[PDB]
Amino acid sequence: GYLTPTSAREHLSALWKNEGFFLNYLFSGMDDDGMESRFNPSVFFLDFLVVPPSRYRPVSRLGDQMFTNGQTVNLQAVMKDVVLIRKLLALMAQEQKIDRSFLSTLPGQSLIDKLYNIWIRL
Amino acid sequence: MTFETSFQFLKQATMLGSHDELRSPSACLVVGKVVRGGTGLFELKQPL
Amino acid sequence: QKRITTPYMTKYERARVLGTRALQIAMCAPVMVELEGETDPLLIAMKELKARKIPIIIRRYLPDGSYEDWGVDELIITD
Amino acid sequence: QQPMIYICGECHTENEIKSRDPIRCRECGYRIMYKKRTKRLVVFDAR
Amino acid sequence: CGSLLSPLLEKPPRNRKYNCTLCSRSDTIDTVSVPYVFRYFVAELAAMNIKVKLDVV
Amino acid sequence: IVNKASWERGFAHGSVYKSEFIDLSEKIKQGDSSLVFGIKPGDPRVLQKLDDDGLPFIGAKLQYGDPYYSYLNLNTGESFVMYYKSKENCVVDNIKVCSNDTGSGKFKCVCITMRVPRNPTIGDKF
Amino acid sequence: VGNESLNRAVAKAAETIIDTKGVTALVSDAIHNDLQDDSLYLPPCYDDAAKPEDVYKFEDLLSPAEYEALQSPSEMIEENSHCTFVIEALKSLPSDVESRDRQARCIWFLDTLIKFRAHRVVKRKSALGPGVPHIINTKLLKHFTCLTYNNGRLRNLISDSMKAKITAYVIILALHIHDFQIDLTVLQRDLKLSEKRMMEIAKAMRLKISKRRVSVAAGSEEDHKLGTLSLPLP
Amino acid sequence: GASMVINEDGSRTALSAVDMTQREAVAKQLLTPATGAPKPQGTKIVCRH
Amino acid sequence: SKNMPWRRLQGISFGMYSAEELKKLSVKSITNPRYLDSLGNPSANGLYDLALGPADSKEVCSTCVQDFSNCSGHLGHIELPLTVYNPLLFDKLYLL
Amino acid sequence: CLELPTYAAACALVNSRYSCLVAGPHQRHIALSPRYLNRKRTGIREQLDAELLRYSESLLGVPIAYDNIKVVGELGDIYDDQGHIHLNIEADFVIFCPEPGQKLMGIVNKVSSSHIGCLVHGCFNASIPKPEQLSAEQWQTMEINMGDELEFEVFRLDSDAAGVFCIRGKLNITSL
DNA sequence: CTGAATTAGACAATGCTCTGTGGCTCTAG
RNA sequence: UAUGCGCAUAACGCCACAGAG
Ligand SMILES: [Zn+2]
Ligand SMILES: [Zn+2]
Numbered sequence A: 001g002y003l004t005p006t007s008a009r010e011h012l013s014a015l016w017k018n019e020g021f022f023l024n025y026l027f028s029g030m031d032d033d034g035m036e037s038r039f040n041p042s043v044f045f046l047d048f049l050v051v052p053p054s055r056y057r058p059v060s061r062l063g064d065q066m067f068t069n070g071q072t073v074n075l076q077a078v079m080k081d082v083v084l085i086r087k088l089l090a091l092m093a094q095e096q097k098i099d100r101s102f103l104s105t106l107p108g109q110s111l112i113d114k115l116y117n118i119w120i121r122l
Numbered sequence B: 001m002t003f004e005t006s007f008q009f010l011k012q013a014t015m016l017g018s019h020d021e022l023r024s025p026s027a028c029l030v031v032g033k034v035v036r037g038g039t040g041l042f043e044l045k046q047p048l
Numbered sequence C: 001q002k003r004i005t006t007p008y009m010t011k012y013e014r015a016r017v018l019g020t021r022a023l024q025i026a027m028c029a030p031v032m033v034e035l036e037g038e039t040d041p042l043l044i045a046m047k048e049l050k051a052r053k054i055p056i057i058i059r060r061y062l063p064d065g066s067y068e069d070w071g072v073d074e075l076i077i078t079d
Numbered sequence D: 001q002q003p004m005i006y007i008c009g010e011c012h013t014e015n016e017i018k019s020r021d022p023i024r025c026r027e028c029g030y031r032i033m034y035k036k037r038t039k040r041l042v043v044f045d046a047r
Numbered sequence E: 001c002g003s004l005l006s007p008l009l010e011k012p013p014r015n016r017k018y019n020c021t022l023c024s025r026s027d028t029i030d031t032v033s034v035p036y037v038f039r040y041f042v043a044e045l046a047a048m049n050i051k052v053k054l055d056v057v
Numbered sequence F: 001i002v003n004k005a006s007w008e009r010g011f012a013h014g015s016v017y018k019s020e021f022i023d024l025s026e027k028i029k030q031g032d033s034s035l036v037f038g039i040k041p042g043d044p045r046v047l048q049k050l051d052d053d054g055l056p057f058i059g060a061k062l063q064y065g066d067p068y069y070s071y072l073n074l075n076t077g078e079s080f081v082m083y084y085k086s087k088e089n090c091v092v093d094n095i096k097v098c099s100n101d102t103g104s105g106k107f108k109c110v111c112i113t114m115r116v117p118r119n120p121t122i123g124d125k126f
Numbered sequence G: 001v002g003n004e005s006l007n008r009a010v011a012k013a014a015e016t017i018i019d020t021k022g023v024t025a026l027v028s029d030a031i032h033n034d035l036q037d038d039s040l041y042l043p044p045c046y047d048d049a050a051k052p053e054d055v056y057k058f059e060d061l062l063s064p065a066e067y068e069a070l071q072s073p074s075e076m077i078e079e080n081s082h083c084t085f086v087i088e089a090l091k092s093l094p095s096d097v098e099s100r101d102r103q104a105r106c107i108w109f110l111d112t113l114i115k116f117r118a119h120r121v122v123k124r125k126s127a128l129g130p131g132v133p134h135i136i137n138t139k140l141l142k143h144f145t146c147l148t149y150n151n152g153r154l155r156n157l158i159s160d161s162m163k164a165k166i167t168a169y170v171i172i173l174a175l176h177i178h179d180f181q182i183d184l185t186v187l188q189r190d191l192k193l194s195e196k197r198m199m200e201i202a203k204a205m206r207l208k209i210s211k212r213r214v215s216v217a218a219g220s221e222e223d224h225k226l227g228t229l230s231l232p233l234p
Numbered sequence H: 001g002a003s004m005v006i007n008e009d010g011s012r013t014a015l016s017a018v019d020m021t022q023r024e025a026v027a028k029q030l031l032t033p034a035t036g037a038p039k040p041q042g043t044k045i046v047c048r049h
Numbered sequence I: 001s002k003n004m005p006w007r008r009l010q011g012i013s014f015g016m017y018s019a020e021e022l023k024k025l026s027v028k029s030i031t032n033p034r035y036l037d038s039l040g041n042p043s044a045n046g047l048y049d050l051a052l053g054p055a056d057s058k059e060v061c062s063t064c065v066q067d068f069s070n071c072s073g074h075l076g077h078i079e080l081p082l083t084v085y086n087p088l089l090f091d092k093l094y095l096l
Numbered sequence J: 001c002l003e004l005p006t007y008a009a010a011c012a013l014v015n016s017r018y019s020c021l022v023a024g025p026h027q028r029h030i031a032l033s034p035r036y037l038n039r040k041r042t043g044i045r046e047q048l049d050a051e052l053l054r055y056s057e058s059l060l061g062v063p064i065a066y067d068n069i070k071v072v073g074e075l076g077d078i079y080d081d082q083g084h085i086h087l088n089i090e091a092d093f094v095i096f097c098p099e100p101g102q103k104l105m106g107i108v109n110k111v112s113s114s115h116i117g118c119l120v121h122g123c124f125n126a127s128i129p130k131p132e133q134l135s136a137e138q139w140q141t142m143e144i145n146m147g148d149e150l151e152f153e154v155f156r157l158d159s160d161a162a163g164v165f166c167i168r169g170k171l172n173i174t175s176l
Numbered sequence K: 001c002t003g004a005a006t007t008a009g010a011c012a013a014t015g016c017t018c019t020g021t022g023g024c025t026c027t028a029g
Numbered sequence L: 001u002a003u004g005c006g007c008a009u010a011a012c013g014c015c016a017c018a019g020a021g
């Protein structure tokens, strides 16, 4: 059985509810001075990436041709996939649960849930 | 980090919550501070 | 307490004493010695070191964090 | 006044070329044209 | 709170003061002298959700 | 050690011929595809320093900051001038003007070749 | 290996994320597919850029010698962007001098916009040129610049987005003024820009676009026209 | 010689290679006290060769 | 003019952030995958948005009002729809 | 007329019933120039005079006068590569900490259509907007204490562009 | 019915500084 | 940031070859 990140978060949260007194000493990063549940298992997971400032990601133009650097390209490859998942969760919305298109068929599937392949892609 | 495999030592320092006292010669030059050896073991004070 | 380090000024201390004092004479700090036509602040700082007329305190930090204070007047300078 | 003469690479005939006209030799149609050197003062040192 | 990422300038009404976005107090902000590549370093570590906490004393 | 008087006579004197191929389509991509070498007549940036085709004379010398070529936009009228950015004084050797493969190309590709003197100095390797 | 059991394990998180963010918030994923081309006016409601207060009643001149004075003659190279000396042919049909049209002779606002755009990012000028309409100067310093801290002082700057906003509003003015047939290459000649800019602004007016270089040999030695849009009336 | 003269407020007066009149005017204007700008903490810096 | 820094780093510590602390640090949720429009300017809600820093001297910021020479730079965030692992901690998450 | 007040035993006690000239000893930080190794008092007084009439969020107000200049410690902290010696001072200040909506008094410069600049304690050129949209007939027929001395309210405070803590407060007559 | 040593695979490192030119950076569907 | 006269123009990487000590 596949273990989704939303299920692994709940498994860490229950494991931390039990065994957190010990694992706060192996992971001392978050929340300085180390008393009353400082580290938390939510840093094992990402709800959002962080876009670094745009002055550290400059585009290198040379006579009417822009060239993006690699950092902005990897962030854009995350973001196009984010848009794709957001449209697909819109399609699972109002379906077995107006203004729909069903245009998204580019991922790999034989089912409705392309969420598996598009999760591993994200 | 400045020696080798900087990402693994960065990952260990982030997991363990490691503190750097900034007294190494590499750590003083990362943060732009005068290195402790040589003409940096001491400080000069102006009497008032 | 009794100061238990070297009575001699080390070679690293006279570099930073001459650097700090020449940076002071680079600003309009008053010169304690007679300028014999020098325009270089290093040469003026060397004349002030030779004449024992620099007032700066060297704070010699020991590796536990402790220190002890020495004026350049009470250090033995050599060539 | 003082036309811009260009010399064909093959037939070496002199070609006047304006801004808008296509460049090719008026006799043999060749594609490379060399600019003519005209009389004008340049000063060099004999050293 | 020891953070380069936290100070922020007020939108003008002048005054030109900074606010720590974390602790919401304008008193604790002062300048240090770092390399510019150290600022690039702490921004690229913030891109990986790594906190760099400075002891500024 | 080289004798000074042999060096002052012709011993091991040289040259280097730099050829710079200037294309107004490839580099100067602003739009409208109608750039041709030329000057706006009455331009004080090119007077007695470029020829009437916006292109230096063949005997000419080029110091730093001299006008190197001039090109004008035909659908607009505005003439631009480009300056010589190298730090070495050269003498223009020849200027060849190129068409496309058909003979239908317009006056926009050119290939200036310049001679830099390079006689033996202190620091040259024999 | 997986199974159809991975479909059930992923469908649990799907049915979870349908909760806590409702179906209206998920149908609102249709945002940011084509939100807005920014830093210019909206596609509807063509009454922009001239509010009915502070209309043109300010510093008006009238002569055919004033038409001749485009180059500012004497015995001072030129004082206009000369698009007004193109629109003067359409302006001369109600009246040759000081035409009281239903466009209210608002071409001087376009002139002040081009005089403001070419003037650079650094402005010591509290008043721009003569600077007689102060509410117009207020609208320019409110919408067509950006304030900036500098060493405890403040200075208005004209960013590239602002320079594109001014230019796009000049386009929107000159389209309805010159009855949807405009000569953009005159603006290229007089205002020192590139033709990639005007082609990309033509792309920015994507809705109902069909452009043709109509007038050939219109000048003394060159051809210049582009800017046919063929839009419904304002 | 000197490439430029840094003033007391951090403004860099670049010396001109063309005219000696500007450089004479700058050389007269050295050593003068704190000007109408309220920055009396420093003197000028001459970036000499 | 006056030396603006006289403070001094005594030490540096490495840790992780909570997501609340980044969401306080971030100034703009970044949504649009298209960087630049047809007219060349940076987009709204894109990776080069001006609520972050300007990337060159030709523009100013939106959060602060400074130019490129005085803007510190600002963080933005791509709000992911669903949860992904943290690749820094994926090995230790696998072991736990 | 921007005339420099002396300390004057706490500025002749201009902490009146209205104007808040609170006095309390404070410590400041001084980057002394190396030309003041001798005459340290002169350089400290000069940098404190540079600090005057400028709002300090650490002092929570605007200093108008200082006295009892005392030096904390006899050692001056020369940092690494810079020339300025950094000594920590202790002085007794008289500071001006205003608030929004509170009472002040002023000596006027002008009364135009919309600008009234009143000197608060002879230093602060505090401007007052004259109309408060109640009537335009209150511009003439004075009735707003149009004399040499005036008392007013403050709604916002924003510093001036060059070396002055400016005060922008409307007149706010108690009746009408 | 599970700790045991062992072995194959993965991976990380491999001198320093400097000067040029030339092609390509989104062509394929 | 550089050049030119506050103004105008130009604001780069990755491979692969070749070379210097
Ligand atoms: Zn021929
Ligand atoms: Zn804080």
Ligand SMILES: [Zn+2]
Residues within 6 Å of the ligand: I051, I052, I053, I054, I061, I062, I063, I064, I065, I066, I071, I072, I073, I074
């Ligand atoms: Zn900013």
